[PDB]
């Protein structure tokens, strides 16, 4: 008895099982649709430090997957390469059908070592991990996924009104992270600017900030040196908060731009 | 409304598999067709905030039932939920012994 | 025909979706594979249970033949096919009102 939403006159009335309302008309199975809506649209924190907290590892529960016919572009998607600290596999390899989430503005690729208590990784929020029209309850290794929930819809009159046209470019950038103690409270992440330069990661940092940081490091960060890989603590030294608003929020406009000079860098050690 | 939920995204940018009717070229053929990445299509439903927002709420609500249904089922891969909803709809409206002028049966004279 | 029919049926079934209200629906915060099942005992009616056992024994013939025909490794559509067939027979086409082939009750 999953709730089946009925769209009438561009208004969403969830259906009533017992009522068998005469009005609603299901002409064909085309009208039936499953929609996978991302969590990022729900106002949840979407940065990898906070997002990892919602994911969790448990064992003794079999993984399940569902198909969602249509999905929403996700600003942030995550690809995990977690391995156990001895190098053992932590996340199950993707089954043949499973493929990466189709449309992602920012792919957060986390490769690192973490305690891996459970056989599989599950979403503590109850949501599904969306993979290319397949919604799973378990994280699969090395496949881009966007955490989301699946909604089932009865589309209106199949008159091309909904999901057939835009009533009214795909460029995906990979933000590569490295993590230790993945899946525990004591987790630390390093944003990987390049092979030799890493930046300590905090929740405040947004993907736009991280890309700007990458540019700033490249232009004037003296990233290349013989000392070794450099881990930099970074703080935007601007009075306003960094990326409080969500991606949709205020169309991300009139947003203060943190010129390269504002960012402050110190070497952790 | 969706203020129970902390933030509702006003814009819905949806990616979906292409419609069967639109494609006419010799790209249906798998060999000559688009790769997995290219099959998708795009849309934006920004104009109507109320429907899409309600929709996010509906998805948050339905996830509980979906999870329980998955727990009960033994399906490794479940693709029959929509069909089961369809058969439920038909079985419900037209299960049988439906009065010609009754609440149970949709049929209406003339 | 059956030699001995167990009069009482102790059945293990998956939990009702309506029954669960706690945050155990969440897979991570939830019962393991063993916990999902819900118990029951249909001891009240012996005749029904013995009919059910006879029915199962008779149906296995068709079930095995149907499995042979199908190429499914795992066949989960038998119930859906029964529902579709039930609807298709009741309402396949051109129901006759007065006629009992399609039983729609005039007032």
């Amino acid at each position, epitope marked *: 008895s999953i709730p*089946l939403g009925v769209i009438h006159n561009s208004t969403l009335q969830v259906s009533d099982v017992d009522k068998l309302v005469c009005r609603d008309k299901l002409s064909s199975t085309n009208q039936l649709r499953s929609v996978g809506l991302n969590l990022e649209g729900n106002g949840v924190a979407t940065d990898v430090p906070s997002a990892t907290k919602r994911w969790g590892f448990r064992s003794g529960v079999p993984p399940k997957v569902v198909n969602y016919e249509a999905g929403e572009w996700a600003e942030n998607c995550y690809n995990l390469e977690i391995k156990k600290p001895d190098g053992s596999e932590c996340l199950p390899a993707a089954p043949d059908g499973i493929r990466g989430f189709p449309r992602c503005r920012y792919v957060h690729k986390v490769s690192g070592t973490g305690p891996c208590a459970g056989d599989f990784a599950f979403h503590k929020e109850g949501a599904f991990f969306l993979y290319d029209r397949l919604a799973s309850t378990v994280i699969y290794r090395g496949t881009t996924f966007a955490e989301g929930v699946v909604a089932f819809l009865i589309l209106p009159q199949a008159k091309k009104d909904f999901f057939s046209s835009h009533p009214l470019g795909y460029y995906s950038t990979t933000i590569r992270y490295q993590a230790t103690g993945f899946g525990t409270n004591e987790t630390e992440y390093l944003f990987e600017v390049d092979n030799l330069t890493y930046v300590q990661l905090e929740s405040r940092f947004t993907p736009q900030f991280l890309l700007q940081l990458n540019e700033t490091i490249y232009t004037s960060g003296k990233r290349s040196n013989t000392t070794g890989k450099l881990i930099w603590k970074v703080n935007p030294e601007i009075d306003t908060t960094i990326g409080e608003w969500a991606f949709w929020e205020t169309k991300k406009n009139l947003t203060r731009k943190i010129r390269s000079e504002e960012l402050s860098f110190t070497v952790v050690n | 409304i969706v203020n129970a*939920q902390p933030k509702c995204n006003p814009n819905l940018h949806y990616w979906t598999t292409q419609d069967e009717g639109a494609a006419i070229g010799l790209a249906w053929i798998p060999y000559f067709g688009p790769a997995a990445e290219g099959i998708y299509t795009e849309g934006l439903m920004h104009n109507q905030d109320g429907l899409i927002c309600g929709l996010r709420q509906l998805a948050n609500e339905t996830t509980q039932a979906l999870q329980l249904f998955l727990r009960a089922t033994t399906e490794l891969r479940t693709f029959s939920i929509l069909n089961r909803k369809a058969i439920d709809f038909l079985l419900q409206r037209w299960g049988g012994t439906c009065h010609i002028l009754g609440p149970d049966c949709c049929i209406e004279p003339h | 025909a059956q030699p001995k029919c167990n009069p009482n049926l102790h059945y293990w079934t998956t939990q009702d979706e309506g029954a669960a209200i706690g945050l155990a629906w969440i897979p991570y915060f939830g019962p393991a594979a063993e916990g999902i099942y819900t118990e029951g005992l249909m001891h009240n009616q012996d005749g029904l249970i013995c009919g059910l056992r006879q029915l199962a024994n008779e149906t296995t013939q068709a079930l095995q033949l149907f499995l042979r025909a199908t190429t499914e490794l795992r066949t989960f559509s038998i119930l859906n096919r029964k529902a579709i067939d039930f609807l298709l027979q009741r309402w396949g086409g051109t129901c006759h009102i007065l006629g009992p082939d399609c039983c729609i009750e005039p007032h």
Partner: antibody, heavy 115, light 103 residues
Framework: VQLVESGGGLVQPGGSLRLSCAAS????????MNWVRQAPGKGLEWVST????????YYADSVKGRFTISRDNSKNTLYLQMNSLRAEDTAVYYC???????????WGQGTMVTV | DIQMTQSPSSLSASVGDRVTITCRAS??????LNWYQQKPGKAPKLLIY???SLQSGVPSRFSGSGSGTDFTLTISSLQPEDFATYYC????????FGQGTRL
């Protein structure tokens, strides 16, 4: 910020009663409101809950087939249609809103139903 | 199903004292216990979000303690308004309440 309950009264064993819980200061449509029944001197038990949009209706074991609960989101009102009332149902009923562990957070003033 | 038991059915203490009220679950619930304070004759008020988290606007003196199977609530200073009865609710399955505890 306020939940108001109404419809309580005297009903003979059997029969039906409708309990109306109305939301003031909240858009009830958004939140999943719940009904909790406190028997006099015998503690609290949860009787039913609804999803925000009304798609999911959830009932306790005792009233699984007896109570029908529905929400009119337009009016920010919740209706609990008690039916086939039994002797034990003679208790005050509270309507509350869901929380982090399916936790009733804002409690409207209880109404009394007597059989 | 799981059965909720508050160990102290009733206890009496003076103002300014340390008191712990314990609610025990027959089977472990993953920190899904929330506490309710019911003033006598008034609708219950939520206290602890889930085992430890303290509801906004509830006095900080109330402290939520949580564990896998056994949960406790401690009142720091026993002000007179806090002398009212308390309840424990589980959220693992069926949302049962423990038998109320009387101060």
């Amino acid at each position: 910020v306020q939940l108001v309950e109404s419809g309580g009264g005297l009903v003979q064993p059997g029969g039906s009663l409708r309990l109306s819980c109305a939301a003031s200061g909240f858009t009830s449509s958004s939140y999943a409101m719940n009904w909790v029944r406190q028997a006099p001197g015998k503690g609290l038990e949860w009787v039913s809950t609804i999803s925000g949009m009304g798609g999911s209706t959830y009932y306790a074991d005792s009233v699984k087939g007896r109570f029908t609960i529905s929400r009119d989101n337009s009016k920010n009102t919740l209706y609990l249609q008690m039916n086939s009332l039994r002797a034990e149902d003679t208790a005050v009923y509270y309507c509350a809103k869901r929380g982090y562990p399916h936790s009733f957070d804002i409690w409207g003033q209880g109404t009394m139903v007597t059989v | 199903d799981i059965q909720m038991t508050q160990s102290p059915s009733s206890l009496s203490a003076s103002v300014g004292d340390r008191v712990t009220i314990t609610c025990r679950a027959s089977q472990s619930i993953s920190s899904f216990l929330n506490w309710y304070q019911q003033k006598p004759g008034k609708a219950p008020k939520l206290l602890i979000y889930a085992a430890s988290s303290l509801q906004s606007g509830v006095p900080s003196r109330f402290s939520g303690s949580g564990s896998g199977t056994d949960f406790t609530l401690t009142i720091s200073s026993l002000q007179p308004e806090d002398f009212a009865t308390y309840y424990c609710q589980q959220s693992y399955s069926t949302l049962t309440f423990g038998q109320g505890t009387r101060l």
